[PDB]
Amino acid sequence: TAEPRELLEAAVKLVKQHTAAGAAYAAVVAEPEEPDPRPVDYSKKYFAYVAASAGQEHVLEADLYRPAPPEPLPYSFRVLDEKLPMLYVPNVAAEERVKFFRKFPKIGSYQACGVALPASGEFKALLAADTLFPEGSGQPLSADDRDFVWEVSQSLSRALEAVQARAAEAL
Amino acid sequence: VQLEPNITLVLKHLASCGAVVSAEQQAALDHSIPIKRIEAGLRSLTLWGRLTTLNGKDYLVAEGYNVASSKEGAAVYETKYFYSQDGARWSDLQPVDSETATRCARIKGMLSGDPAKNYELEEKPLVFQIPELAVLRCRVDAIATATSVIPTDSTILNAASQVVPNRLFAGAAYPEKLESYQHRFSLPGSGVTLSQDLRGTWAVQYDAFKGVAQVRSLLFPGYFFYYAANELTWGSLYVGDGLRNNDLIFML
Amino acid sequence: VQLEPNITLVLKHLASCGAVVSAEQQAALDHSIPIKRIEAGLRSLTLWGRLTTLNGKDYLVAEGYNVASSKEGAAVYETKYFYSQDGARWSDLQPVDSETATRCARIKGMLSGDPAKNYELEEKPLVFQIPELAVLRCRVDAIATATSVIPTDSTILNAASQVVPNRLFAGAAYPEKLESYQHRFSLPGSGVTLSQDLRGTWAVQYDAFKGVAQVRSLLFPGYFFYYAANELTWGSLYVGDGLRNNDLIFML
Amino acid sequence: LAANRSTLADKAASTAATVDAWAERQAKMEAELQGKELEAVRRRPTFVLRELKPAVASADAVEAAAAELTAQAEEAANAVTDIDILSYMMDKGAITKDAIIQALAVHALGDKAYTNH
Amino acid sequence: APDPVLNELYGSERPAVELLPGVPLSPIVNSCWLPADAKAMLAESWIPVAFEAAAPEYNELVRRLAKTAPFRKWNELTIQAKQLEQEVEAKQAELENVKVQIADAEAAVAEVKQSFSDDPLSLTGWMQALTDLADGGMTTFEVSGQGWPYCSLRQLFGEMPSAAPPAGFFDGVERVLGTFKRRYEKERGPGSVQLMLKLAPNVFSDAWSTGGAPAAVAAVEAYVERARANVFGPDGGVTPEGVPEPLDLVQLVWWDFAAADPLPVLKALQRMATDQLQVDEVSVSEPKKIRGIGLVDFPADRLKAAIQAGVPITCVQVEHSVLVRSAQPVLDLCAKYGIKVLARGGTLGGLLSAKYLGAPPPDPVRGDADLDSVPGCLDAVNNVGGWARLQAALAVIKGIADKHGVKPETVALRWQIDAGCFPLVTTRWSSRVWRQFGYEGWSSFEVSGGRPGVDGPLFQVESFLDVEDVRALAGLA
Amino acid sequence: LSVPLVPAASAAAAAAAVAKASLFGDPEPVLDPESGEPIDPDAPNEFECEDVEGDGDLLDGLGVGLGRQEMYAAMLAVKRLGEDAKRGVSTVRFFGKFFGTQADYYVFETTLQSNPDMPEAPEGTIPLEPYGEGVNAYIYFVSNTLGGPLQQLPYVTPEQIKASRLLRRYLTGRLDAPVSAFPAFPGNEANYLRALIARISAATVCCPRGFFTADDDSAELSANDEWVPLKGREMALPVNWSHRYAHLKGQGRTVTHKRDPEPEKNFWTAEEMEAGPPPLATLDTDAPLPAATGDKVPPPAWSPVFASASVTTRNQVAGVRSNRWPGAVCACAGRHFTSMYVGWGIKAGGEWSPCPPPPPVPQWGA
């Protein structure tokens, strides 16, 4: 039990330490700030990256918006547009929609796990790891490490649900 | 020591005896035998023979079984027979009653080749109609109880009193003598061989250089058995219309 | 459990892999192998393979031996090789020195098909003339020391410390895995199988319904091995020019 | 060696004996089942006439028809089972098949029919 | 609160459990293997062509009519009219109202009785066997039959002509169970029996491999339309409103996972198992056709992969028994994710009985009517470790069944239930009824008396097994 | 050892066996379960084929190919493909068989009653030969087992051929595996197989010399009604075999494409102005393989294959086998000839080496 950002940071540190992935990071499914039984409508949300592995701090200052009409809608939005709790691109070169944060194409595999609240079935975070070459070996991710990332995503979903319950109680 | 006769070796060794199958039927068998063997739950299934018909659609007959057991001094194989007319689709060849067995035994001539045909017999005038598949099953039963040849001491009895392959079988000492072979339904160690059969109903040709013996039935001309002694394989096949040779005393 | 590979079953199972022989050569082998096996005093003699030549007279190669013994942790087979260009008359394929082995290893290309030809090599300018049969024998030696595949635990050691067939062999538990097969020269019970070979130099295709596994060498493309598990037979054959595939890392 | 082969034959005989024993048991149980069913199918008229809980005949017209039936026996002999009684009852129309069916149905309820208090 | 039927029959404290919201799940599930072909079974009849005392009208017709809903309602209306009349101004009006109600119930009973004579299938032997199984408190029927590997493979993996209408392998079983469900719900009101269908597409066919995903979706849709036509009959399946009634559950059988990929089929099913909404008000655009999805024999990784793709997995069928414990990781996973497990091993097709004590192994040529499949049973024997091991274990199962005075075929089912599984047991038919549990001669009303032919200690909230019982059963495999 | 009768991981092999066995004989009439009436059988497709069984006889005589039983199943597979009313084939020829690390391919070369649509070549690239012309004159179907489901391969493009000329790959048997990342091949394994097909079909499919007459107004090969069949071992000579299909230029086409240029000795590049051999060039003229260590003479492009060990034997059959593409053969007995490929799809010659990186672009001011 801790602040949600502490939870995300701990998850990222775990994914980096135990998995042979090159980098791990985490974002929050944010809503656009204001200017100056219905289903969830994710059609107006974005990813705000708030935690990242050791040696990867440029990620903290990165967002991911949907374009407004042609640019490729980034790949990770499949987590939200069709509610896929897990995406795996074993070779980023084969996907157009994947987008790099340093604007320089790289080589490796990518994995995303949409963190969802079990009681409600809504996505709140996104834990990701990859092996883009210069940082970590450009090889794909074994099934063991993919499964470990999945497990960490689920444990984080649990802890996040609990912390949200406590915080909503404290009101 | 083989575990089951191989149709390729059988067709290779018994081709000199005129026991051959069509090329299309050979390929079709190579595919169809495993399918039927699996979907019937059988441990063994082989090509038993081929009976010629008047319309050119010869009956291929296959025989399978699961386990053989010793009952009442006989090695009983719970066999099941299938027939086919193209080599691709096997149908059942159902057993026949004892009363009908006599009637179909009275029917002679080459089979028609139409599984829906039925012959007629007359008795005291009560007429019976016997289906052709009944005649086929009866002829197969007669030929089977007459020959069913295996080498001597190639089988053995196990703890559960079942007849299993003798995997330490060394081979027939004298392959050119009828003592080296026996009927399948004779218990291991019973000392009953083909030499106890009616003298003159079997012929044996042994090529002592290559080591291949051929045992031909003279009572049922068309039943051939082969035994290769350098590779320790053997196997038999029937090819013909299925009628017994009753004039044997005049032909020897 | 077989006692020796059967050329008929080998040619039947490995025909899909393109490992075939001419019809005349097939008949000629059926006659010639026993003659040579007897007049050489050998217990085993089989068709090892067939090397293609530039003039159309491919070399058939046969390999025989008498007994295999365990020496220095290896199951050594005192093998003897014969060659032929028609399948009827077998000549000796004499061993080659170690010094000449390197030179013939340097000679590449498809063989000429003329046993009297000799190639030339140049060194520091000393020229050597290497007979074609020397090149043939060394290619055969290389392919043999590379593959020589048998099933695992199909052999066994006897009291005289000789490698003999394991007549109680029950079969490979998992026929689609490389652990089920081994090199011939690996001692029984040594735990060395084909999985200890360089990963990626073997391919295995297993038809789980009929029970026939095919093991292909990728390092020496042209070496095929088959294992039939319902009848417990197996056997291998080489067909091709005899050159090793050195580009394997780029082709996988 | 001789002892071992004797023992093997003995054990096979034992197995055959167990198969025969189970076959005997099944035959005997089926025999008893058929006997029970025949006994039950015989006593049906005596049940629907005498002991049927919802009375279809109240046992009085029963005896009236029994007397009128035994009456004809004298003209038959000079010139009786419950099933015959029921035949006469149904033929005259004293009992209809649907009444028998509904009464048997009410009876079929186990301790939960309206035969309470 | 215990179930109002199990508690009555076996004195069970067990509460009613649900597979999905709105669908109950009995503790044992009847895997329905047919005794003949559906075309034959659907053509049987009971109406034969001064007091017979042996007709079906006096023996089976009455034992059916007594168990109906309108007849029991009529009986309770009379039992209440008695008390209302023995209590008595306004109560006279109440009595007249009850009299009207009784007249209506009587007319309804007359009609439901005439229905038996109108439908020539209502009184057959297989309808009786299924109904008797239902009244025993097992109202969940799973479509099954003889299948891979011991069936007509040319019918399983064959290629059908173009004019052939789409029909799965288990189409006849679905037609038969649908006729039975319709009749049973006609007699005893809706929601009484729960059918679990089984979809097994020909992954290796020509159209499949040539069509891609837009064919793997049309196949699923056509199968669902066919299944609705089979279960709900021609006209049924649609509520008074335009909203159709959904099928209970669809199980997916996948032949090879490296050949083809399940995910298109699973996503199509999932789309059919959710209500597709739309907003201007949030209203339904597409009603659901399915309530849930099950997976038959997924190897603990394709199950986790289907989870990670976010499909709602309701139940997982598995083969788990006292001797066959291969599907253990699937159990450890379905526990962690809260997914019901239907085990189908149980008694090894019939080999866990007293008939096979000291017996010889069956033989597929001779035949054996006391097994589901002789080849399948011998396959199970090989997977156990032989027939000697099967004998050595059946001895222990018999000892345990004796120590507690119960059938040997209930020790195994209880060992299954103790592992969180819902046992799946094969239906027996036509004078072999209830032998699936070990009850002999139960085909006659005289030996049974109308009782269910299954031991009660199975349905208790606590297991009748001693500690040493568990210690011995945990040493078999 | 104690195993089941057949493992549970065998439904794929069982489906393959059922498909293969369904080739023989007539199909059984199936009925409608709900109705009880027999289902109407499909009307058969009208097509023309060769005699695949006789070709099997020839190749078995020579001692090359698949075997006499595989060729019968292949004949029946050709019969099945030619009879599918859906695919609408009008002519079939069994091409051959490619090995693979995990499965194998059986190939069928056909023409259709109505070709599909070919997307226009994106500009900046060599144009495409339409259906029925040059390389894309035959539509190819492929399967992993005889009688199994047939997947139509896509048309081939010059870029695919030119790119495949740089690869040395073992096939895998899966029509959608990745071929290679560098050199960048543009497609999956299906396109690489189509490329190998297009190269081999032009380098190795032959007919006996003088069997056809080449027209100079077109490329249509009509057969002279006066051609005396050569007899005996003389068909074991490459000088009597003519290339049946057009040569394949280094540009990736059978007819090289020249763009709009006035002295075209320096504008048109070499590969753009390449002219190959004339129609029906004999196998005597094909370029030999490079010399190998141990001999100075370049090995020939083709070799003879004989059906007997004595020249005196009557009714011999003979043919030639390729040395560039080990596995392809042509044979002829009388007026009956055939050509067939069985192999890995690996060109031999020792003229392959790893591709180096593309040259890094230089700066603007050079």
PDB file of N, CA and C in Angstrom, chain C residues 15-17 20 22 24 50 52-56 58 86 106-108 110 117 119-120 170 205 207-208 216 218 245 247-248 250-252, chain F residues 1 10 13 60-61 63-66 97 99-104 168-170 292-295 303-304 306 308-309 321 323 346 352 354:
ATOM      1  N   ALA C  15      11.364 -42.889 -50.163  1.00  0.00           N
ATOM      2  CA  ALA C  15      11.138 -42.470 -51.537  1.00  0.00           C
ATOM      3  C   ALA C  15      10.525 -41.082 -51.608  1.00  0.00           C
ATOM      4  N   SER C  16       9.702 -40.719 -50.623  1.00  0.00           N
ATOM      5  CA  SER C  16       9.146 -39.373 -50.580  1.00  0.00           C
ATOM      6  C   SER C  16      10.234 -38.321 -50.457  1.00  0.00           C
ATOM      7  N   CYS C  17      11.341 -38.652 -49.806  1.00  0.00           N
ATOM      8  CA  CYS C  17      12.467 -37.743 -49.680  1.00  0.00           C
ATOM      9  C   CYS C  17      13.348 -37.728 -50.912  1.00  0.00           C
ATOM     10  N   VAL C  20      15.850 -42.410 -54.125  1.00  0.00           N
ATOM     11  CA  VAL C  20      15.385 -43.509 -54.954  1.00  0.00           C
ATOM     12  C   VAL C  20      16.562 -44.090 -55.722  1.00  0.00           C
ATOM     13  N   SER C  22      17.349 -46.646 -59.409  1.00  0.00           N
ATOM     14  CA  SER C  22      16.763 -47.119 -60.652  1.00  0.00           C
ATOM     15  C   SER C  22      16.120 -48.488 -60.455  1.00  0.00           C
ATOM     16  N   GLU C  24      16.320 -51.175 -62.649  1.00  0.00           N
ATOM     17  CA  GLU C  24      17.343 -52.171 -62.931  1.00  0.00           C
ATOM     18  C   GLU C  24      18.306 -52.309 -61.768  1.00  0.00           C
ATOM     19  N   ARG C  50      24.266 -43.598 -52.610  1.00  0.00           N
ATOM     20  CA  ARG C  50      24.377 -43.437 -54.054  1.00  0.00           C
ATOM     21  C   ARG C  50      24.853 -42.021 -54.339  1.00  0.00           C
ATOM     22  N   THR C  52      25.990 -39.151 -57.034  1.00  0.00           N
ATOM     23  CA  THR C  52      25.763 -38.781 -58.420  1.00  0.00           C
ATOM     24  C   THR C  52      27.057 -38.322 -59.070  1.00  0.00           C
ATOM     25  N   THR C  53      27.164 -38.570 -60.372  1.00  0.00           N
ATOM     26  CA  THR C  53      28.362 -38.261 -61.131  1.00  0.00           C
ATOM     27  C   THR C  53      27.992 -37.464 -62.373  1.00  0.00           C
ATOM     28  N   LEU C  54      29.019 -36.945 -63.041  1.00  0.00           N
ATOM     29  CA  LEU C  54      28.809 -36.056 -64.174  1.00  0.00           C
ATOM     30  C   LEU C  54      28.502 -36.792 -65.467  1.00  0.00           C
ATOM     31  N   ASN C  55      28.814 -38.080 -65.558  1.00  0.00           N
ATOM     32  CA  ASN C  55      28.585 -38.834 -66.782  1.00  0.00           C
ATOM     33  C   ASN C  55      27.411 -39.794 -66.669  1.00  0.00           C
ATOM     34  N   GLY C  56      26.662 -39.743 -65.575  1.00  0.00           N
ATOM     35  CA  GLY C  56      25.462 -40.533 -65.444  1.00  0.00           C
ATOM     36  C   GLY C  56      25.642 -41.899 -64.827  1.00  0.00           C
ATOM     37  N   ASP C  58      26.289 -43.261 -61.677  1.00  0.00           N
ATOM     38  CA  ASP C  58      26.391 -42.979 -60.257  1.00  0.00           C
ATOM     39  C   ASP C  58      27.048 -44.137 -59.522  1.00  0.00           C
ATOM     40  N   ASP C  86      26.868 -50.441 -61.553  1.00  0.00           N
ATOM     41  CA  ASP C  86      25.712 -51.060 -62.182  1.00  0.00           C
ATOM     42  C   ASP C  86      24.822 -51.802 -61.205  1.00  0.00           C
ATOM     43  N   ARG C 106      40.115 -31.374 -49.829  1.00  0.00           N
ATOM     44  CA  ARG C 106      40.172 -30.100 -50.534  1.00  0.00           C
ATOM     45  C   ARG C 106      39.529 -30.145 -51.913  1.00  0.00           C
ATOM     46  N   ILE C 107      39.244 -31.327 -52.445  1.00  0.00           N
ATOM     47  CA  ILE C 107      38.685 -31.444 -53.786  1.00  0.00           C
ATOM     48  C   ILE C 107      37.169 -31.377 -53.702  1.00  0.00           C
ATOM     49  N   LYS C 108      36.569 -30.499 -54.498  1.00  0.00           N
ATOM     50  CA  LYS C 108      35.135 -30.276 -54.462  1.00  0.00           C
ATOM     51  C   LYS C 108      34.556 -30.466 -55.855  1.00  0.00           C
ATOM     52  N   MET C 110      31.096 -32.151 -58.250  1.00  0.00           N
ATOM     53  CA  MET C 110      30.512 -33.462 -58.479  1.00  0.00           C
ATOM     54  C   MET C 110      31.548 -34.390 -59.098  1.00  0.00           C
ATOM     55  N   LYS C 117      40.024 -41.817 -63.314  1.00  0.00           N
ATOM     56  CA  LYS C 117      40.445 -40.426 -63.307  1.00  0.00           C
ATOM     57  C   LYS C 117      41.175 -40.098 -62.014  1.00  0.00           C
ATOM     58  N   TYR C 119      42.452 -36.386 -59.913  1.00  0.00           N
ATOM     59  CA  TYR C 119      42.507 -34.938 -59.838  1.00  0.00           C
ATOM     60  C   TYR C 119      43.899 -34.489 -59.427  1.00  0.00           C
ATOM     61  N   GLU C 120      44.140 -33.190 -59.548  1.00  0.00           N
ATOM     62  CA  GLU C 120      45.434 -32.605 -59.243  1.00  0.00           C
ATOM     63  C   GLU C 120      45.293 -31.510 -58.199  1.00  0.00           C
ATOM     64  N   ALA C 170      11.953 -51.914 -26.853  1.00  0.00           N
ATOM     65  CA  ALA C 170      10.519 -51.682 -26.924  1.00  0.00           C
ATOM     66  C   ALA C 170      10.136 -50.545 -27.856  1.00  0.00           C
ATOM     67  N   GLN C 205      10.632 -34.909 -38.844  1.00  0.00           N
ATOM     68  CA  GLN C 205       9.212 -34.848 -39.158  1.00  0.00           C
ATOM     69  C   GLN C 205       8.577 -36.155 -38.722  1.00  0.00           C
ATOM     70  N   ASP C 207       5.058 -38.333 -38.377  1.00  0.00           N
ATOM     71  CA  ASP C 207       3.651 -38.573 -38.681  1.00  0.00           C
ATOM     72  C   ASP C 207       3.074 -39.403 -37.545  1.00  0.00           C
ATOM     73  N   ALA C 208       2.433 -38.736 -36.589  1.00  0.00           N
ATOM     74  CA  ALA C 208       2.012 -39.403 -35.367  1.00  0.00           C
ATOM     75  C   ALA C 208       0.878 -40.389 -35.580  1.00  0.00           C
ATOM     76  N   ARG C 216      16.246 -35.908 -41.139  1.00  0.00           N
ATOM     77  CA  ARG C 216      17.057 -35.439 -42.249  1.00  0.00           C
ATOM     78  C   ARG C 216      18.262 -34.679 -41.728  1.00  0.00           C
ATOM     79  N   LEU C 218      20.774 -31.743 -42.105  1.00  0.00           N
ATOM     80  CA  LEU C 218      20.912 -30.464 -42.781  1.00  0.00           C
ATOM     81  C   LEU C 218      22.361 -30.095 -43.018  1.00  0.00           C
ATOM     82  N   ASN C 245      27.486 -29.096 -46.452  1.00  0.00           N
ATOM     83  CA  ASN C 245      26.829 -27.797 -46.553  1.00  0.00           C
ATOM     84  C   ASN C 245      27.478 -26.857 -45.548  1.00  0.00           C
ATOM     85  N   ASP C 247      27.348 -23.424 -45.734  1.00  0.00           N
ATOM     86  CA  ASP C 247      26.572 -22.206 -45.570  1.00  0.00           C
ATOM     87  C   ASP C 247      25.419 -22.366 -44.606  1.00  0.00           C
ATOM     88  N   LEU C 248      25.474 -23.350 -43.709  1.00  0.00           N
ATOM     89  CA  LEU C 248      24.300 -23.686 -42.910  1.00  0.00           C
ATOM     90  C   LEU C 248      23.867 -22.525 -42.025  1.00  0.00           C
ATOM     91  N   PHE C 250      23.818 -19.428 -42.645  1.00  0.00           N
ATOM     92  CA  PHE C 250      23.050 -18.454 -43.402  1.00  0.00           C
ATOM     93  C   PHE C 250      21.725 -19.000 -43.902  1.00  0.00           C
ATOM     94  N   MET C 251      21.525 -20.313 -43.857  1.00  0.00           N
ATOM     95  CA  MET C 251      20.331 -20.921 -44.418  1.00  0.00           C
ATOM     96  C   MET C 251      19.273 -21.243 -43.380  1.00  0.00           C
ATOM     97  N   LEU C 252      19.641 -21.322 -42.111  1.00  0.00           N
ATOM     98  CA  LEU C 252      18.673 -21.586 -41.062  1.00  0.00           C
ATOM     99  C   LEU C 252      17.883 -20.335 -40.716  1.00  0.00           C
TER     100      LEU C 252
ATOM    101  N   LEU F   1       7.347 -50.670 -22.768  1.00  0.00           N
ATOM    102  CA  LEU F   1       6.774 -49.417 -23.238  1.00  0.00           C
ATOM    103  C   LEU F   1       5.261 -49.560 -23.246  1.00  0.00           C
ATOM    104  N   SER F  10      -2.346 -35.782 -32.639  1.00  0.00           N
ATOM    105  CA  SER F  10      -2.237 -36.377 -33.964  1.00  0.00           C
ATOM    106  C   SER F  10      -3.458 -36.102 -34.827  1.00  0.00           C
ATOM    107  N   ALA F  13      -2.240 -35.009 -38.433  1.00  0.00           N
ATOM    108  CA  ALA F  13      -1.806 -36.129 -39.256  1.00  0.00           C
ATOM    109  C   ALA F  13      -2.986 -36.990 -39.680  1.00  0.00           C
ATOM    110  N   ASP F  60      10.553 -43.531 -62.735  1.00  0.00           N
ATOM    111  CA  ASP F  60      10.970 -44.708 -61.988  1.00  0.00           C
ATOM    112  C   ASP F  60      11.968 -45.526 -62.784  1.00  0.00           C
ATOM    113  N   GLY F  61      11.759 -45.631 -64.096  1.00  0.00           N
ATOM    114  CA  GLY F  61      12.755 -46.266 -64.938  1.00  0.00           C
ATOM    115  C   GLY F  61      14.112 -45.607 -64.809  1.00  0.00           C
ATOM    116  N   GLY F  63      15.194 -43.749 -62.345  1.00  0.00           N
ATOM    117  CA  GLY F  63      15.714 -43.773 -60.996  1.00  0.00           C
ATOM    118  C   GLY F  63      15.791 -42.401 -60.371  1.00  0.00           C
ATOM    119  N   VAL F  64      14.793 -41.570 -60.661  1.00  0.00           N
ATOM    120  CA  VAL F  64      14.673 -40.235 -60.094  1.00  0.00           C
ATOM    121  C   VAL F  64      13.200 -39.979 -59.821  1.00  0.00           C
ATOM    122  N   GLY F  65      12.934 -38.988 -58.980  1.00  0.00           N
ATOM    123  CA  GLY F  65      11.561 -38.627 -58.698  1.00  0.00           C
ATOM    124  C   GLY F  65      11.092 -39.041 -57.323  1.00  0.00           C
ATOM    125  N   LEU F  66       9.805 -39.350 -57.205  1.00  0.00           N
ATOM    126  CA  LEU F  66       9.178 -39.634 -55.922  1.00  0.00           C
ATOM    127  C   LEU F  66       8.968 -41.119 -55.667  1.00  0.00           C
ATOM    128  N   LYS F  97       8.038 -31.047 -56.193  1.00  0.00           N
ATOM    129  CA  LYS F  97       8.011 -31.059 -54.741  1.00  0.00           C
ATOM    130  C   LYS F  97       9.251 -30.394 -54.164  1.00  0.00           C
ATOM    131  N   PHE F  99      11.332 -29.569 -50.577  1.00  0.00           N
ATOM    132  CA  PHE F  99      11.476 -30.006 -49.201  1.00  0.00           C
ATOM    133  C   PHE F  99      11.337 -28.816 -48.259  1.00  0.00           C
ATOM    134  N   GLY F 100      11.553 -29.069 -46.979  1.00  0.00           N
ATOM    135  CA  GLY F 100      11.459 -28.030 -45.979  1.00  0.00           C
ATOM    136  C   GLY F 100      11.858 -28.578 -44.634  1.00  0.00           C
ATOM    137  N   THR F 101      12.149 -27.663 -43.717  1.00  0.00           N
ATOM    138  CA  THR F 101      12.627 -28.078 -42.407  1.00  0.00           C
ATOM    139  C   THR F 101      11.509 -28.665 -41.557  1.00  0.00           C
ATOM    140  N   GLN F 102      10.273 -28.218 -41.756  1.00  0.00           N
ATOM    141  CA  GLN F 102       9.158 -28.696 -40.958  1.00  0.00           C
ATOM    142  C   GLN F 102       8.029 -29.308 -41.764  1.00  0.00           C
ATOM    143  N   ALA F 103       7.937 -29.025 -43.055  1.00  0.00           N
ATOM    144  CA  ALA F 103       6.974 -29.680 -43.925  1.00  0.00           C
ATOM    145  C   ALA F 103       7.496 -29.567 -45.348  1.00  0.00           C
ATOM    146  N   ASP F 104       6.705 -30.038 -46.306  1.00  0.00           N
ATOM    147  CA  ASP F 104       7.095 -30.018 -47.705  1.00  0.00           C
ATOM    148  C   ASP F 104       5.972 -29.421 -48.532  1.00  0.00           C
ATOM    149  N   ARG F 168      20.030 -17.650 -49.828  1.00  0.00           N
ATOM    150  CA  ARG F 168      20.314 -19.081 -49.765  1.00  0.00           C
ATOM    151  C   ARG F 168      19.607 -19.587 -48.513  1.00  0.00           C
ATOM    152  N   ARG F 169      18.369 -20.042 -48.671  1.00  0.00           N
ATOM    153  CA  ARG F 169      17.500 -20.337 -47.543  1.00  0.00           C
ATOM    154  C   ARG F 169      16.942 -21.746 -47.638  1.00  0.00           C
ATOM    155  N   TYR F 170      16.948 -22.453 -46.514  1.00  0.00           N
ATOM    156  CA  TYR F 170      16.123 -23.639 -46.362  1.00  0.00           C
ATOM    157  C   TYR F 170      14.679 -23.211 -46.154  1.00  0.00           C
ATOM    158  N   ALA F 292      35.525 -26.059 -60.122  1.00  0.00           N
ATOM    159  CA  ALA F 292      35.721 -26.386 -58.719  1.00  0.00           C
ATOM    160  C   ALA F 292      37.146 -26.866 -58.489  1.00  0.00           C
ATOM    161  N   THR F 293      37.592 -26.757 -57.242  1.00  0.00           N
ATOM    162  CA  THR F 293      38.952 -27.149 -56.903  1.00  0.00           C
ATOM    163  C   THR F 293      39.168 -28.626 -57.196  1.00  0.00           C
ATOM    164  N   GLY F 294      40.248 -28.930 -57.908  1.00  0.00           N
ATOM    165  CA  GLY F 294      40.579 -30.280 -58.300  1.00  0.00           C
ATOM    166  C   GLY F 294      40.507 -30.528 -59.789  1.00  0.00           C
ATOM    167  N   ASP F 295      39.867 -29.642 -60.544  1.00  0.00           N
ATOM    168  CA  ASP F 295      39.774 -29.794 -61.984  1.00  0.00           C
ATOM    169  C   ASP F 295      39.586 -28.420 -62.608  1.00  0.00           C
ATOM    170  N   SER F 303      23.570 -33.185 -67.278  1.00  0.00           N
ATOM    171  CA  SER F 303      24.212 -34.485 -67.318  1.00  0.00           C
ATOM    172  C   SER F 303      23.217 -35.506 -67.841  1.00  0.00           C
ATOM    173  N   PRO F 304      23.688 -36.675 -68.257  1.00  0.00           N
ATOM    174  CA  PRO F 304      22.771 -37.728 -68.688  1.00  0.00           C
ATOM    175  C   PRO F 304      22.370 -38.648 -67.548  1.00  0.00           C
ATOM    176  N   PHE F 306      20.666 -42.679 -67.247  1.00  0.00           N
ATOM    177  CA  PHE F 306      20.431 -43.880 -68.030  1.00  0.00           C
ATOM    178  C   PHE F 306      19.531 -44.844 -67.275  1.00  0.00           C
ATOM    179  N   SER F 308      19.589 -48.163 -67.814  1.00  0.00           N
ATOM    180  CA  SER F 308      20.137 -49.505 -67.925  1.00  0.00           C
ATOM    181  C   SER F 308      21.652 -49.417 -67.908  1.00  0.00           C
ATOM    182  N   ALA F 309      22.286 -50.535 -67.575  1.00  0.00           N
ATOM    183  CA  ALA F 309      23.738 -50.600 -67.523  1.00  0.00           C
ATOM    184  C   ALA F 309      24.355 -51.111 -68.812  1.00  0.00           C
ATOM    185  N   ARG F 321      19.516 -34.468 -66.376  1.00  0.00           N
ATOM    186  CA  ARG F 321      19.305 -33.879 -65.065  1.00  0.00           C
ATOM    187  C   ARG F 321      20.157 -32.631 -64.934  1.00  0.00           C
ATOM    188  N   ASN F 323      22.485 -29.709 -63.346  1.00  0.00           N
ATOM    189  CA  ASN F 323      23.532 -29.554 -62.352  1.00  0.00           C
ATOM    190  C   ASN F 323      23.493 -28.198 -61.673  1.00  0.00           C
ATOM    191  N   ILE F 346      17.640 -25.162 -53.701  1.00  0.00           N
ATOM    192  CA  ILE F 346      18.907 -24.481 -53.479  1.00  0.00           C
ATOM    193  C   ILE F 346      19.741 -24.609 -54.740  1.00  0.00           C
ATOM    194  N   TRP F 352      27.717 -18.237 -54.257  1.00  0.00           N
ATOM    195  CA  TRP F 352      26.975 -17.440 -53.295  1.00  0.00           C
ATOM    196  C   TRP F 352      27.873 -17.082 -52.123  1.00  0.00           C
ATOM    197  N   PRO F 354      27.818 -14.058 -48.511  1.00  0.00           N
ATOM    198  CA  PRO F 354      26.943 -13.129 -47.789  1.00  0.00           C
ATOM    199  C   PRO F 354      26.929 -11.747 -48.419  1.00  0.00           C
TER     200      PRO F 354
END
